[PDB]
Amino acid sequence: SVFSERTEESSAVQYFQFYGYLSQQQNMMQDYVRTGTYQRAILQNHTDFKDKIVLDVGCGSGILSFFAAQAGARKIYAVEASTMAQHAEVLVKSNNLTDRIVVIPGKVEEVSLPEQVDIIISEPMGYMLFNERMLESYLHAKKYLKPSGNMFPTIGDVHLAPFTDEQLYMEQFTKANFWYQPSFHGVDLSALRGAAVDEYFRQPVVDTFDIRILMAKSVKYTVNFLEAKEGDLHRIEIPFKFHMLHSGLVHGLAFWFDVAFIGSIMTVWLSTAPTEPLTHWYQVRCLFQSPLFAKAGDTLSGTCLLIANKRQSYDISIVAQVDQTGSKSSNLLDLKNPFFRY
Amino acid sequence: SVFSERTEESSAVQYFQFYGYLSQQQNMMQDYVRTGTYQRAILQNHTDFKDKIVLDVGCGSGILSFFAAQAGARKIYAVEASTMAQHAEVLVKSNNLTDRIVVIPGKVEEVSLPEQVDIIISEPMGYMLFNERMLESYLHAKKYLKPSGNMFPTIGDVHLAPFTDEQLYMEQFTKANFWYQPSFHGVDLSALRGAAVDEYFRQPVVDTFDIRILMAKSVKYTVNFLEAKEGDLHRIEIPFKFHMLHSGLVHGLAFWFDVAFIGSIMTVWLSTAPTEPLTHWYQVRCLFQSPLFAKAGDTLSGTCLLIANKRQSYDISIVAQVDQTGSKSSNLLDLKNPFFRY
Ligand SMILES: Nc1ncnc2c1ncn2[C@@H]1O[C@H](CN(CCCNc2ccccn2)CC[C@H](N)C(=O)O)[C@@H](O)[C@H]1O
Ligand SMILES: Nc1ncnc2c1ncn2[C@@H]1O[C@H](CN(CCCNc2ccccn2)CC[C@H](N)C(=O)O)[C@@H](O)[C@H]1O
């Protein structure tokens, strides 16, 4: 299938094993912004579910299918590839909804559905939106979507902005400088310093931060899920031109995302911005190995390039430049191995 | 080879991926009990290394080979299966030891050595000693050992003791009681509470504790690495009869280990006991499903049976009983998926 065609088997095993655990499900359900926002988007747009056929892609514990049933769906097919599917079936029986919610075990790329659906619901967003590469499964599920069917979420906005954070930079730099040691128990480690710094600087930093560290207004990059094809997510190129509002050192770029549920009654937004209550997606910063100095009024321009890999993640290229001085920075980051600083 | 026949390939991929990172190596090197004890055991037994042939099994960064070089080894073969081997080679060159230390990439079960060795060194201990199943690679490397050759470490002692920890025991039900809710956003979750409880009790708990919670002297189970076969580790049966030193409720068993480097000059001990400074092995606790009351002077008897699996770990089966009252408890735990509580 398309899933095994883009996924190393060891990565898939670890991934689905991880999501089979009830403790993980408990952790995600306790993100109240996330669960309450999903419920609000589905229930306040009840007309998009009343007597309709719905597909829930990666239903996990099944919570979104319960929301869809509460809003009046006639039938919901809930597709889930991990052993969580078994737990989801247990809940469907204990809540007396077997006439409404049909759990289908398997990958959405591999299963067979009996009919086309009026609406697709899912929670396919990983860190930085794109990590885990579940957006591609979500878009693949459009083969089951009737013409003029809807998607929940409907669109995704990624935000990027340059930041300054000397304490974060020094934390990572001093960790790497352990390898500057010429006599660690009598041994010279310093030939590996460059390797160690590379290793540490490829790790995107998952945590939250004050918005005072941002040095420019965010640039926005939009994926419309009603219109994107899976192959659009293999290579994601985000050009950027920042107009610097503060002078100082740019230590890297900060990423967050909002998704929008564009319903017939209202549009509901779920935001992981640092100006909004905290979610289990936090925010993500990519550090430059060498920061760039900039003056207020300067322009920081460049490209953020995401290349999908077979470990369900992305290789990140950030190339950036201060136009007024020609100072340049090039960075390669490994989204699969984040540093959870929370 | 022997390694691929006892190991699912998906597990081996994750294992070697994990040890490929410089940050893990750094974390291990910063454990001063571990590094300083290995150095001291090798250097203080210099006549066991002077002009000798040494094999280093799972050399990682190379640090123990450098210790063997400090002590005067004529030739050191350093075998390493992860990408860490490439960093090890860089260190061998930058420390001017290319004529004495030969890095061999690959699994010790698969590579070829050019000659027999006088002494084997390694750090094959995982949590509870046996986790990761690296001791079997250690023992397998005795195919390369000369008659009357030595092993460093030479012996391993696993210790078991019963403990009381009412807060730890209760934490499991408090976590699982998140599911005991009839209307989580409209959904009755209660039918999964039992499953959640079962899930939390299969997890051994990796952390430290005050020694006041131990209710008896430890029972010791010894593996003599000079005389053990690989097959001795496939099924590890540890009988116990504890003589209770304190009265109270027994919540489970606590595990730690010591190893001994028995050299010609002296024996050096590396201990992970809770009475000793803390190491990155911490300690391990396995809960009983039901606590057992015991009075001081009673005997708590039973068996801890460790069964090797293909995930490089062990299924742990614990049966215990208070002899004077007939009260019985068991548990079954999966050592590959511990809960890091520290
Ligand atoms: N090809 C596929 N076919 C079928 N099923 C798939 C496929 N791929 C993945 N799955 C499942 O989709 C579930 C993913 N979860 C979302 C995880 C969100 N990730 C985050 C969140 C915050 C921070 C970081 N990461 C769904 C949530 C669900 N609505 C619920 O409420 O539980 C997991 O069960 C996965 O196994
Ligand atoms: N069949 C095999 N063939 C070849 N190589 C193998 C095989 N199997 C494993 N390896 C390597 O052995 C290394 C293991 N490390 C020890 C790490 C375990 N320590 C802990 C501590 C706490 C909790 C868990 N674990 C050696 C450290 C070395 N002395 C140094 O100085 O770094 C890793 O590089 C492994 O890839």
XYZ file of C-alpha atoms and ligand atoms in Angstrom, chain A residues 3 15-16 19 25 28 34 56-64 79-82 84 106-109 123 125-127 132 134 137 280-281, ligand 1:
70
model
C 1.641 3.512 3.595
C 4.592 4.352 15.841
C 1.519 2.109 16.134
C -0.401 4.801 20.029
C -4.590 8.292 24.975
C -3.941 13.420 24.782
C -7.687 20.319 21.895
C -12.914 9.353 11.154
C -9.308 8.748 10.073
C -7.183 7.451 12.923
C -9.936 7.472 15.516
C -7.793 6.278 18.430
C -10.056 6.060 21.503
C -12.898 7.092 19.171
C -13.639 10.450 20.762
C -14.222 12.396 17.562
C -10.549 3.711 10.972
C -7.648 2.944 13.325
C -4.483 0.957 12.710
C -3.191 0.431 16.281
C -6.418 1.075 20.288
C -6.381 -1.129 9.693
C -4.535 1.636 7.868
C -6.774 4.062 5.974
C -4.645 3.338 2.923
C -6.587 14.880 14.155
C -1.370 17.263 13.116
C 2.021 16.400 14.648
C 4.729 18.775 15.956
C 4.375 11.869 11.774
C -0.356 11.633 9.048
C -3.142 9.560 5.271
C 0.259 19.413 23.820
C 1.744 20.582 20.495
N -2.534 5.463 8.351
C -3.340 5.403 9.532
N -4.463 4.717 9.484
C -5.240 4.628 10.525
N -4.944 5.201 11.655
C -3.822 5.915 11.780
C -2.980 6.044 10.722
N -1.944 6.810 11.136
C -2.138 7.147 12.411
N -3.286 6.594 12.819
C -3.881 6.709 14.116
O -4.281 7.895 14.268
C -4.153 8.201 15.734
C -3.537 9.460 15.889
N -4.209 10.330 16.898
C -3.706 11.741 16.802
C -2.291 11.968 17.436
C -1.950 13.483 17.494
N -0.500 13.672 17.563
C 0.082 14.703 18.432
C -0.770 15.502 19.198
C -0.194 16.477 20.011
C 1.194 16.597 20.022
C 1.976 15.753 19.226
N 1.398 14.847 18.456
C -5.662 10.459 16.516
C -6.430 11.150 17.678
C -7.839 10.553 17.845
N -8.801 11.432 17.252
C -8.053 10.440 19.324
O -8.858 11.191 19.878
O -7.422 9.617 19.991
C -3.250 7.064 16.305
O -4.149 6.194 17.136
C -2.762 6.516 15.297
O -2.404 5.116 15.482
